[PDB]
Structures are given as structure tokens and as C-alpha cells.
């Protein structure tokens, strides 16, 4: 097999939902309160949510 | 983790039954990516056998 990947869907100071594509053995999970970065400083500026 | 993990009716059926135990863990803080844990490719172990 080979693991099919999707880019993370990120919303800053917001919330998201799950959209099931019904592809085989689909796994979708949502985690809140992250602090992601990119090269030119933090990707966003929120602290929570 | 063994034979039968991926089941497609033929070479170009464009559909498949998957039983491979994809379990999603939490990503690293301050890092954008999608880590995962699952069983090994059963074909690998069988062709080892």
C-alpha cells in the first residue's frame, strides 16, 4: 500500500469540522490549541483556540 | 499486519477494501505535519515468509 496524505487544515482563533470523503480507511482528527510556525516567524499570532 | 490487508477486485478496479489499522496520534507542538501509527505492510512480512 502507500499512505495517502492531505495537508493539515488550520484555522487560527477558530474551529473546524470533519468532512468524510468515504475513501477507504479514512482517518480525520481535529486538535485545538496549537501554536504552529513557519520560517518567517509564527504562521499565526493567536495563543489559544 | 498480514495478508489480505488491501483487497482490490482487479488491477484497475478503481476501488479497494482496506483493513490496515490507521491510528492517528497528536502532532508535535510548533510543527505542521500529520504523524501516524498503523500495522506494517502485511505483504512485506509474508514475502519474508
Amino acid at each position, epitope marked *: 500500500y502507500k499512505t495517502g496524505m492531505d495537508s493539515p487544515a488550520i484555522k487560527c482563533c477558530g474551529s473546524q469540522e470533519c468532512t468524510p470523503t468515504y475513501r477507504p480507511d479514512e482517518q480525520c482528527k481535529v*486538535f485545538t*490549541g496549537v*501554536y504552529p*510556525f513557519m520560517w518567517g*516567524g*509564527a504562521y499565526c499570532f493567536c*495563543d*489559544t483556540e | 499486519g498480514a495478508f489480505g490487508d488491501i483487497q482490490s477486485r482487479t488491477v484497475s478496479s478503481s476501488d479497494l477494501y482496506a483493513n490496515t489499522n490507521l491510528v492517528l496520534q*497528536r502532532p*508535535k*507542538a*510548533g*510543527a505542521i505535519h500529520v504523524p501516524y501509527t498503523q500495522a506494517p505492510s502485511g505483504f512485506e512480512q509474508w514475502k519474508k515468509d
Partner: nanobody, 113 residues
Framework: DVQLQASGGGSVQAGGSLRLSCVASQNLFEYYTMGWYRQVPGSQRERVALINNGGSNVAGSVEGRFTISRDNAKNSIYLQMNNLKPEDSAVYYC????????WGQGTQVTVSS
């Protein structure tokens, strides 16, 4: 419960230097982003610097004078203050943010002209 114990605060003069140190009761940095927040008496807590595996970002008020470093093995984070000015006096709390949020009890920092 996980506890953040801050130390290194004290009394100094203008132009002096200090090094704060916050130590966590458990190995938590590998999953958390560490932060230092200052609170002037009567003011809201405001961020000083943040650090995680992606690097460190320091507040623009104290750019080039406050620098934050991390040490996962010792479970310690250090904030080296240099060239302090009278307005820097405040209670500094270390914050560990992740799935859960924990706030340090804080230490008093006083700097005199």
C-alpha cells in the same frame, strides 16, 4: 499536577543583567511551547518571549536585550536579561502551553535607575 517553579528574580540596578529559570515537575517541553510573561503590578500579563522546537520569538519591547533558551534534558528554560531599565520591574511568570495550559507562580524582578 504539573507545577512550574520560577526562580532567579531579585533586585538589581539599571544596566544590570539577570537570568530567570523555570523548572517543570515533569518532562513536558517536548510536547509544549514555553513562554515567559511579565506583569507590572496592576497590569495584565503580557508575553515576553516564546520558544519551542521551531525556534524562539521575543517581544519587540525587549528585542536585543532579553533572550530565551530551552534545555529539554534538564527540563529548564532560561531568560537572560541584559541592560535592564526601570520600567522592566514586574512579576514574571513562566507559561507552558499545549493540550493543557499551566502558569508559573512567578518571581519578583525589581530594577532601579
Amino acid at each position: 499536577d504539573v507545577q512550574l517553579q520560577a526562580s532567579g528574580g531579585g533586585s538589581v540596578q539599571a544596566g544590570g543583567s539577570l537570568r530567570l529559570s523555570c523548572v517543570a515537575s515533569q518532562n513536558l517541553f517536548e510536547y509544549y511551547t514555553m513562554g515567559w510573561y511579565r506583569q507590572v503590578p496592576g497590569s495584565q500579563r503580557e508575553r515576553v518571549a516564546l520558544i519551542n522546537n521551531g525556534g524562539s520569538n521575543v517581544a519587540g519591547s525587549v528585542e536585543g536585550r532579553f533572550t530565551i533558551s530551552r534545555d529539554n534534558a534538564k527540563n529548564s528554560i532560561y531568560l537572560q536579561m541584559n541592560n535592564l531599565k526601570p520600567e522592566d520591574s514586574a512579576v514574571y511568570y513562566c507559561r507552558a502551553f499545549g493540550p493543557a495550559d499551566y502558569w508559573g507562580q512567578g518571581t519578583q524582578v525589581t530594577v532601579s535607575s
